[PDB]
A = this chain, B = another copy of it.
Amino acid sequence: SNQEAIGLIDSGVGGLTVLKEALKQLPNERLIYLGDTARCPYGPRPAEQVVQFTWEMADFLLKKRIKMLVIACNTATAVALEEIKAALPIPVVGVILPGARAAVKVTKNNKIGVIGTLGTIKSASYEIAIKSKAPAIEVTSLACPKFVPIVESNQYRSSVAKKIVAETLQALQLKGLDTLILGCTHYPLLRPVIQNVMGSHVTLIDSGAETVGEVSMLLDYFDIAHTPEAPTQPHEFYTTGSAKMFEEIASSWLGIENLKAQQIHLG
């Protein structure tokens, strides 16, 4: 039971921003990742469809007997999370609130910004979360549909990427924000470009990175932590797309040479 793995789902490589942090904070925890690279991008897809696809990724991992489910995707979290948490016996973790509480703790301006997919922005989740914590804070949300493709295409270091991020982020310019929430688990791979565009006066919040911290206490809370020894079975990486392009960017961002990945089918 406790030696069972922790499963992480996402639409593609975004989930890896959370996974990377889990390797660093929870070294003795076995992980099983699933990225629906085939149906990506979610962020615009209709909520109902996203709820569907997400459940599909869940069922795929449930058959592998995971002890905890981490929806390392803002889009999925925003629409799916309550429903899947209520339905499953194991604990389910989303990435919105951890990012929201971290932003609230770091802002000195009370002027916070958040960027994410269409779906995340439309759900007004981050607005709704921040309001319930500190209503005096002014939140400015912005959808950035062009970002995710830049990451999936493994061109998040390109000059092209820099120009897109720049023009897209100009809409948040001159609004006095001192904190910007990376409301998409894909955005941390663009962090250096985003930090450069926003300036050194703006603190970036990595939503998924903050989530691992919550994961850590939940393991103790539900007393289902893995024994303090590096797992026997290695970490499993699945993708519904080119298992090869996955390994390409996965191994680079994670720093894992010869990172294995296996393509699969859903729905």
Contact = CB atoms under 8 A, between A and B. Distances in A.
A interface, over-half SS: helix
A134 B220 contact: no
Number of copies: 2
B217 A131 contact: no
Interface string A108-119: 000000000000
Contacts of A214: 217, 221
Contacts of A218: 217, 221
Contact of A133 (B217, B221, B228): B228
Contacts of A50: none
Interface in A211-227: 213-214, 216-218, 220-221, 225, 227
Interface residues of A, number: 21
Contacts of A175: none
Contacts of A229: 132, 135
Contacts of A133: 225, 228
Nearest to A27: B134
A97 B221 CA distance: 9
A101 B132 contact: no
13 contacts: A101-B220, A131-B228, A132-B225, A132-B227, A132-B228, A132-B229, A133-B225, A134-B228, A135-B229, A213-B217, A214-B217, A217-B218, A218-B221
